[PDB]
Amino acid sequence: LVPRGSHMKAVQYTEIGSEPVVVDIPTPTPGPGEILLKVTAAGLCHSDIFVMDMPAAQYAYGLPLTLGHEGVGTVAELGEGVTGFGVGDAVAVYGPWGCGACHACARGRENYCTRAADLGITPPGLGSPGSMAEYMIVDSARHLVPIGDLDPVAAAPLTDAGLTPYHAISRVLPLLGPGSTAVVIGVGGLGHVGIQILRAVSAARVIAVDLDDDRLALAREVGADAAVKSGAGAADAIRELTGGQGATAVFDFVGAQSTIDTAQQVVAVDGHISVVGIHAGAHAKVGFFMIPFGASVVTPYWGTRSELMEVVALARAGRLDIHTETFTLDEGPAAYRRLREGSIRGRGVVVP
């Protein structure tokens, strides 16, 4: 698609319960401190679905909403006083914006900003204009990470399919020494990247759990030491491979009550369960004799800027091979339909 003036194509969620639609909205202009990006790739994500399935009550993200919370692009116009990027610069968009000033933000951890709810700072494509348009605004230089000559299509999923699993893993990386076992439940958009991250940054043994045969082989293709079929037999299968020793960490990318249950029955004493996937209602039960002593559970949120940099560094060293399928802006809504039915293999990416 060619740049053609004062408006741009965007993929907007317009009405609750409706499908998203392509619209020609005005191209924004960066205020002072803001940056305008020419979007070069915008990732689709299952999360996008969840948000679009909230009822009139639940949903508090305001309409219309340009979707797309995984976004990379080139610098188009710098707002007033923004130095430290030049027009043409390829950047990835750091997703979970924060106040930049509370204790958490001051330590890098914006994803856990203690203020961004109050101040109404929301991420692009999840409350602020997202990346699935020809252009987007980013509030602050602080939320741009350089990516150099990385391919945008492969870069885009890094902002979430890379960052989110990286963070979860990172939370307990000291535990994942040689000898340790990491269980990755689900080999979807996130699972298949988590596996690679586990290999690149740790020496843990990785055991993948999914339903389809071709998923298990995908798991093997990307570095999973072993692969087992998810379901009521998955716990025993894992205990089998672990010699009954139980796994150091379980990263549940699926996040169903099924999988969380498995995770609780395989997790090692003094291990960790990280519930990364959203299924409304699904929850671990952490109480004496319902989970091993010392086994900590958490639901992590996205990742940190230093993480996002670290993820880009992995990709730029050829350590991450994200599986993509390219779409057009126009194909935007059609891509969503593809996602609901779970036929997109790997991660879908829109390319203006």
Ligand X SMILES: NC(=O)C1=CN(Cc2ccc(CO)cc2)C=CC1
Q: Which residues bind ligand X (CB under 6 A)?
A: 45, 47, 50, 69, 126, 160, 164, 276, 278, 300-302
DSSP run (H or E) holding 5: none
Q: Take residue 286 and report the two structure tokens written for it.
A: 């952490």
Residue 25 lies near a copy of itself (rule: CB under 8 A) = yes
Please identify which residue in 133, 195, 226, 282 interacts with a copy of itself, judged by CB under 8 A.
226
Residues in CB range of 247: below 8 A, 6 or more apart: 181, 182, 183, 207, 238, 266, 267, 268, 271
Please identify which residue in 240, 269, 283, 286 interacts with a copy of itself, judged by CB under 8 A.
240
CA 342/CA 236 separation, integer angstroms: 27
Residue 160 lies near Zn ion (rule: CB under 5 A) = yes
R_g over Cα of the chain: 20
- Window 255 to 314, contacts with a copy of itself (CB under 8 A): 304-306, 309-310
Site string for a copy of itself, 78-117 (x = CB under 8 A): -xxxx-x--------------xxx-x--xxx---------
Q: Which does 98 bind (CB under 5 to 8 A by kind): ligand X, Zn ion, a copy of itself, none?
A: Zn ion
User: How many Cβ atoms from other residues are within 10 Å of residue 299's Cβ?
Assistant: 16
Q: Which does 218 bind (CB under 5 to 8 A by kind): Zn ion, a copy of itself, ligand X, none?
A: a copy of itself
Q: Of 14-22, 173-181, 190-198, 247-255, which part binds a copy of itself (CB under 8 A)?
A: 14-22
CA 83/CA 219 separation, integer angstroms: 43
Distance (Å) of CA 137 to CA 27, 35, 70, 108, 147? 10, 6, 13, 22, 18
CA 300/CA 171 separation, integer angstroms: 9
Residue 330 lies near a copy of itself (rule: CB under 8 A) = yes
Residue 12 lies near a copy of itself (rule: CB under 8 A) = yes
- Window 28 to 67, contacts with a copy of itself (CB under 8 A): 31-34, 63-64
Per-position b or e across 271-294, b if 16+ CB within 10 A of its CB:
bbbbbbbbeeebebeeeeeebbee
Q: Of 24-32, 152-160, 235-243, 310-318, which part binds Zn ion (CB under 5 A)?
A: 152-160
CA 180/CA 248 separation, integer angstroms: 6
CA 346/CA 323 separation, integer angstroms: 5
For the bound state, the minimum distance from the C-beta of residue 126 to Zn ion, rounded and expressed in Å, comes to 9
- Among residues 36 and 344, whose Cβ is nearest to ligand X? 344
For the bound state, the minimum distance from the C-beta of residue 15 to a copy of itself, rounded and expressed in Å, comes to 5
Residue 168 lies near a copy of itself (rule: CB under 8 A) = no
